[PDB]
Amino acid sequence: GLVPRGSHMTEVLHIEGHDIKVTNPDKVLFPEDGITKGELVDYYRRISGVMVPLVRGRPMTMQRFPDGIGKEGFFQKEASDYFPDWVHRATLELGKGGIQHQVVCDDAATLVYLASQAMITPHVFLSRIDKVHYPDRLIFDLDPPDNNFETVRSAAKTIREALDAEGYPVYLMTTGSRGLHVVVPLDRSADFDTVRAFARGFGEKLTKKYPDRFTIELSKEKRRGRLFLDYLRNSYGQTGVAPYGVRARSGAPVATPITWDELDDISGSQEYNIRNIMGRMDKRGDAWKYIDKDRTSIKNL
Ligand code: NA
């Protein structure tokens, strides 16, 4: 279950002053691809320059696969006791009662260390820990009911035009699976309840305009094949796949920020993957480089 590549039993990377040990780097995590633990860590190391700004401050849930994606992996919200103290934790009060300590990935060392701990996919809050109930992202999470990319691509364009028509900045990323997130950056002046009411009301208006096409029906059977305008990530405690996060799918696809024009150049949500994304970055640059400069507020409050 190796692709031997000359690695030592343990490689030590030196990132931002921290020694990060990568044990068994030639262990295969993607069996159809021969993508090893080391190659995954190297992906997160080179992508860190663009990804760190997009995940810093966010409570992060880890989807870890110590034996690769062909075997069972797990979600983990409570930070491991053995993570070094320089890996930031956020202290969160559970609605249950009591507290949870989640990782916050505030720098490249942390990102690389989490990859070395077999994190494949990071999932992050729509808010940052210094104002954890006040999102800086509004997400519409679009998946096609027919598993056809054109279905989600056309919905994403219409939704973008509807938000652009109201005066909002609209950003976009693939999820590296089947879907797209349409994203409005926010200035953190409204709390989640306000943002989510907006998102639901917007979805409701869009549904009334295109009633055979879109739905906000919460029950899957009532949808009757219409695309769900999923506003439900806009709550405290919800996560979305991190921008530049790897999915646990063959080919190692990446949830990639893309421009609206680029949406027509691609063929599907898994267009970019750890092995072809560097060519993309070289040619196109980070589509979300200025996302936070466009941070805005909900109109008519
Ligand atoms: Na939100």
Author numbering: 13 to 313
Pull verbatim passages from the article behind this deposition:
The AP–NHEJ repair complex is primarily composed of a Ku homodimer, DNA ligase (Lig), DNA polymerase (Pol) and a phosphoesterase (PE). Studies on NHEJ repair in Mtu and the archaeon Methanocella paludicola (Mpa) demonstrated that both species possess equivalent core AP–NHEJ components, with orthologous proteins possessing near identical substrate specificities. We discovered that Pol has DNA strand displacement activity during RNA synthesis and that PE resects excessive incorporation to promote efficient break ligation. In this current study, we sought to extend our understanding of AP–NHEJ by comparing crystal structures of the archaeal (Mpa) Pol and PE with those of the established bacterial (M. tuberculosis and P. aeruginosa) DSB repair complexes.
We purified Mpa Pol and crystallized the enzyme, as described in the methods. The structure of Mpa Pol was elucidated at 1.95 Å resolution and a ribbon representation of its structural features is shown in Figure 3A. Mpa Pol shares close structural homology with the bacterial NHEJ polymerases from M. tuberculosis and P. aeruginosa. Based on the close structural similarities between all these polymerases, we can infer that the key structural elements such as Loop 1, Loop 2, the 5′-phosphate binding pocket and the active site perform similar functions in the DSB repair process. Having shown that Mpa Pol is a bona fide member of the AP–NHEJ polymerase family, we next superposed the structure onto that of Mtu PolDom in complex with an incoming nucleotide and DNA. We found that the nucleotide and DNA substrate of the Mtu PolDom structures overlaid precisely with the Mpa Pol structure. The Mpa and Mtu Pols do not have strictly conserved primary amino acid sequences, yet both Loop 1 and Loop 2 adopt similar formations, suggesting a conserved function. We previously reported that Mpa Pol, in common with other NHEJ polymerases, is preferentially a DNA-dependent RNA polymerase with an innate capacity to perform strand displacement synthesis. Examination of the crystal structures of Pol reveals that these enzymes contain a prominent surface protrusion that plays a critical role in this displacement activity. We identify that a conserved arginine residue in this structure acts as a molecular wedge against the annealed interface of the downstream DNA and is critical for enabling displacement synthesis during polymerase extension that occurs during AP–NHEJ repair. The structural architecture of the archaeal NHEJ Pol reported here shows that it is highly similar to the bacterial NHEJ polymerases, supporting conservation in the functional mechanisms of these enzymes in DSB repair.
